[PDB]
Amino acid sequence: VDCTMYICGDSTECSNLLLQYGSFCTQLKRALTGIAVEQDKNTQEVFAQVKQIYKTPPIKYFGGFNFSQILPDPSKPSKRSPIEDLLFNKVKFNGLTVLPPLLTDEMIAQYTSALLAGTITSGWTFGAGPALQIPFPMQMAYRFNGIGVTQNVLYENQKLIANQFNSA
Amino acid sequence: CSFGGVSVITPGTNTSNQVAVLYQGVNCTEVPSNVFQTRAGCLIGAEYVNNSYECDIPIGAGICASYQTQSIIAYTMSLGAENSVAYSNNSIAIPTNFTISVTTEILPVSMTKTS
Amino acid sequence: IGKIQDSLSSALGKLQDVVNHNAQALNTLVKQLSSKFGAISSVLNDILSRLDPPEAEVQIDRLITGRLQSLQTYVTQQLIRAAEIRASANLAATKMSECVLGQSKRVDFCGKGYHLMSFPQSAPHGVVFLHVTYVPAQEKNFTTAPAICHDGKAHFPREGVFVSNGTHWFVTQRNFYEPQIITTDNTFVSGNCDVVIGIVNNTVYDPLQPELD
Amino acid sequence: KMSECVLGQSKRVDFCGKGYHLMSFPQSAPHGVVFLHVTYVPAQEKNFT
Numbered sequence: 138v139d140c141t142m143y144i145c146g147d148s149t150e151c152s153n154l155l156l157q158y159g160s161f162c163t164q165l166k167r168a169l170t171g172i173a174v175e176q177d178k179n180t181q182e183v184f185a186q187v188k189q190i191y192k193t194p195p196i197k198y199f200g201g202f203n204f205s206q207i208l209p210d211p212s213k214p215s216k217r218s219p220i221e222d223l224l225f226n227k228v229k230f231n232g233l234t235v236l237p238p239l240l241t242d243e244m245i246a247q248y249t250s251a252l253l254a255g256t257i258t259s260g261w262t263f264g265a266g267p268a269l270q271i272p273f274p275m276q277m278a279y280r281f282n283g284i285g286v287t288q289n290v291l292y293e294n295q296k297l298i299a300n301q302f303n304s305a
Numbered sequence: 306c307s308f309g310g311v312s313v314i315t316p317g318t319n320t321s322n323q324v325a326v327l328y329q330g331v332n333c334t335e336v337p338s339n340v341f342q343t344r345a346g347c348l349i350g351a352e353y354v355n356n357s358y359e360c361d362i363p364i365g366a367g368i369c370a371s372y373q374t375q376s377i378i379a380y381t382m383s384l385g386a387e388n389s390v391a392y393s394n395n396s397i398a399i400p401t402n403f404t405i406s407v408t409t410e411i412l413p414v415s416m417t418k419t420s
Numbered sequence: 421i422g423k424i425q426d427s428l429s430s431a432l433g434k435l436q437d438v439v440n441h442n443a444q445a446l447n448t449l450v451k452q453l454s455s456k457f458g459a460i461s462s463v464l465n466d467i468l469s470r471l472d473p474p475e476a477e478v479q480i481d482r483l484i485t486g487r488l489q490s491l492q493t494y495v496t497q498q499l500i501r502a503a504e505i506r507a508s509a510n511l512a513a514t515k516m517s518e519c520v521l522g523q524s525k526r527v528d529f530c531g532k533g534y535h536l537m538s539f540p541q542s543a544p545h546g547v548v549f550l551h552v553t554y555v556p557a558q559e560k561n562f563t564t565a566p567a568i569c570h571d572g573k574a575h576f577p578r579e580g581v582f583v584s585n586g587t588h589w590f591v592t593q594r595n596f597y598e599p600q601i602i603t604t605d606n607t608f609v610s611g612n613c614d615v616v617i618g619i620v621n622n623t624v625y626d627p628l629q630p631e632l633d
Numbered sequence: 634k635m636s637e638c639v640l641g642q643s644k645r646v647d648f649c650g651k652g653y654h655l656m657s658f659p660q661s662a663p664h665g666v667v668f669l670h671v672t673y674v675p676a677q678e679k680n681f682t
């Protein structure tokens with residue numbers, strides 16, 4: 138908000154009278170500018186949590202499990218996924234102005250798809266260093282160990298577990 | 306009729322005294338070389354290149370500026386490198402060495418007590 | 421540790437920022453003692469010298485209202501800035517508990533890598549943590565299998581991964597390459613080898629069987 | 634949450650959904666983020682001595 142243009146607004150008898158109040162309008166513009174600079178740091182801290190922009194391999198077959206509804210859609214200008222397309226369809230004046238965000242949401246969708254391909258291809262290794270590939274069934278079996286289940290319970294029930302994931 | 310803020314982009318007076326100017330959300334045909342139209346306004350005094358670097362000075366809507374190519378330039382920031390994991394249904398990568406690293410983290414705990 | 425000392429001796433912007441903010445507000449408070457707010461001057465010894473008491477009340481009230489407004493704006497913005505310093509100190513108190521008096525498993529809470537240990541250092545109005553982490557390096561690829569079939573049974577590693585250097589099959593631990601012969605001491609058995617997908621055929625060595633004989 | 638539920642596996646109870654956290658996937662929303670948490674839920678118990 139332009140303090141002077143909201144208050145006075147064009148007139149000139151009002152600007153000289155408002156000049157008598159000191160730095161009340163400089164403080165308000167500083168306060169609003171700090172807020173706007175904080176909104177970009179919010180988004181940088183949530184989404185730019187990845188060194189490289191990782192890609193999934195073309196074959197796209199992770200021991201079964203089916204991630205097609207959450208991987209990016211190549212037939213789109215925005216390259217969003219099917220669920221990211223569902224989510225985006227559900228949500229000048231007297232000195233007032235709206236600034237645009239630093240990151241487009243194409244860029245945000247590109248950060249999220251890289252976080253997804255890091256996880257589906259390397260498990261948790263890309264979050265601690267270089268991405269180390271591992272087959273998805275074996276990564277799922279490592280995770281079953283982390284909750285205290287023995288890892289043949291996964292390999293002997295792989296198809297059922299993959300069907301339950303797909304239905305959910 | 307048109308109003309908007311004016312911003313000045315500078316590489317720092319310890320580097321140069323050249324400057325670029327952003328007229329915020331103003332159509333670049335009604336401002337009063339390099340005139341460049343952005344989703345964030347009209348930029349004057351920077352040339353638009355086709356490369357893409359890491360962001361230096363944030364302009365907005367995906368556009369950043371830098372003093373590189375000097376002068377001031379515009380472009381679209383870089384999300385990051387490009388790493389391609391050689392994923393397969395029977396391949397694994399295992400580390401053979403390690404590094405010990407140490408980093409810092411700074412946090413404010415207090416401010417000054419005034420009366 | 422020798423490089424922290426160079427990089428600092430040659431970065432404390434978050435501590436500088438809170439000092440600057442407070443000074444910029446205290447200066448704005450004093451610089452308001454010289455505005456009229458719609459009066460004849462900014463000095464009470466000038467309204468009490470060229471106005472009679474019935475006329476100086478009206479001019480003193482215009483200053484009182486302005487100065488009260490400015491003081492109360494100062495006091496609101498300090499409450500809002502202190503509520504933010506409070507959350508930072510609450511996070512610092514949790515990091516001192518969880519990274520300095522313990523080893524954390526939370527990812528990216530005590531550095532980037534695998535947390536080993538943390539050291540505190542005092543700063544002007546805050547604290548610096550030095551985080552020591554482990555980072556794996558220099559990876560190779562091998563080929564893997566989920567289980568090994570032998571004598572009609574399926575074997576799984578007790579705490580590792582089965583790997584192959586091209587012709588032979590070993591067990592490693594998952595974060596550091598150190599291959600071992602597959603025996604019945606580092607694997608366990610469950611089931612027959614036709615329900616797992618990806619089983620490979622290989623021999624699992626029994627230590628007693630030869631040694632005894 | 635993005636650090637601890639997407640870049641790792643969490644043992645903190647209820648930080649990444651109901652059940653034993655297996656893994657989590659992020660999706661971008663307008664001005665926000667959506668987390669799809671995959672968890673393991675035990676079922677069909679029997680009693681024993």
Ligand SMILES: *[C@@H]1O[C@H](CO)[C@@H](O[C@@H]2O[C@H](CO)[C@@H](O)[C@H](O)[C@H]2NC(C)=O)[C@H](O)[C@H]1NC(C)=O
Pocket residue numbers: 203204205206
């Ligand atoms: C992953 O799941 C999707 C369903 O969400 C599959 O796509 C559907 O497949 C059925 C038949 O299996 C078709 O009738 C639908 O028209 C498909 N929907 C589409 C293409 O949007 C998809 O085939 C699954 N992936 C694999 C590899 O099987």
Ligand SMILES: *[C@@H]1O[C@H](CO)[C@@H](O[C@@H]2O[C@H](CO)[C@@H](O)[C@H](O)[C@H]2NC(C)=O)[C@H](O)[C@H]1NC(C)=O
Pocket residue numbers: 401402403
């Ligand atoms: C693991 O990495 C370390 C480096 O961090 C290697 O040690 C270095 O070896 C080179 C060549 O022999 C020396 O010039 C350096 O002085 C060594 N560094 C240190 C800190 O001593 C080590 O050889 C690697 N190990 C393996 C098995 O590759």
Ligand SMILES: *[C@@H]1O[C@H](CO)[C@@H](O[C@@H]2O[C@H](CO)[C@@H](O)[C@H](O)[C@H]2NC(C)=O)[C@H](O)[C@H]1NC(C)=O
Pocket residue numbers: 391398559560561
């Ligand atoms: C693991 O093996 C893969 C498979 O070859 C290697 O990835 C390939 O590396 C070459 C050369 O760097 C590239 O041209 C290919 O594009 C890569 N991907 C393929 C072939 O899918 C990788 O370098 C190996 N990793 C290690 C650590 O040796």
Ligand SMILES: *[C@@H]1O[C@H](CO)[C@@H](O[C@@H]2O[C@H](CO)[C@@H](O)[C@H](O)[C@H]2NC(C)=O)[C@H](O)[C@H]1NC(C)=O
Pocket residue numbers: 585586587588
């Ligand atoms: C895989 O590792 C094995 C080590 O057990 C290699 O086989 C041995 O290699 C050494 C040196 O070449 C020989 O002295 C041994 O006779 C080999 N056999 C055994 C049973 O130890 C094997 O060459 C490695 N394969 C590859 C492709 O590197």
Ligand SMILES: *[C@@H]1O[C@H](CO)[C@@H](O[C@@H]2O[C@H](CO)[C@@H](O)[C@H](O)[C@H]2NC(C)=O)[C@H](O)[C@H]1NC(C)=O
Pocket residue numbers: 569621
């Ligand atoms: C792993 O070993 C088993 C047993 O040695 C193999 O099973 C035999 O496979 C041959 C060829 O398909 C058949 O003629 C036999 O009847 C099988 N015997 C039994 C008991 O199943 C199995 O094929 C081996 N796997 C691989 C990939 O070679």
Ligand SMILES: *[C@@H]1O[C@H](CO)[C@@H](O[C@@H]2O[C@H](CO)[C@@H](O)[C@H](O)[C@H]2NC(C)=O)[C@H](O)[C@H]1NC(C)=O
Pocket residue numbers: 678679680
């Ligand atoms: C395990 O046994 C207990 C009883 O010891 C079962 O709880 C009983 O459930 C029945 C049927 O709902 C009730 O009529 C009883 O009153 C319950 N017992 C008590 C003491 O309240 C329990 O449902 C059984 N669970 C399983 C999985 O078998």
Ligand SMILES: *[C@@H]1O[C@H](CO)[C@@H](O)[C@H](O)[C@H]1NC(C)=O
Pocket residue numbers: 319320
């Ligand atoms: C600022 O100026 C000093 C001396 O003129 C120089 O050493 C330093 O590199 C300059 N900083 C930048 C960012 O150019």
Ligand SMILES: *[C@@H]1O[C@H](CO)[C@@H](O)[C@H](O)[C@H]1NC(C)=O
Pocket residue numbers: 332333334342
């Ligand atoms: C500025 O005005 C011209 C003339 O109508 C128009 O062609 C152009 O699209 C306008 N700018 C933008 C950003 O639309």
Ligand SMILES: *[C@@H]1O[C@H](CO)[C@@H](O)[C@H](O)[C@H]1NC(C)=O
Pocket residue numbers: 353354355
């Ligand atoms: C950038 O690349 C595009 C490709 O469509 C081209 O048309 C344009 O002229 C290039 N810009 C410059 C400044 O060379």
Ligand SMILES: *[C@@H]1O[C@H](CO)[C@@H](O)[C@H](O)[C@H]1NC(C)=O
Pocket residue numbers: 200394617618
């Ligand atoms: C892996 O994929 C190959 C295709 O190249 C296929 O022949 C093989 O059966 C698959 N094995 C597993 C364990 O998925």
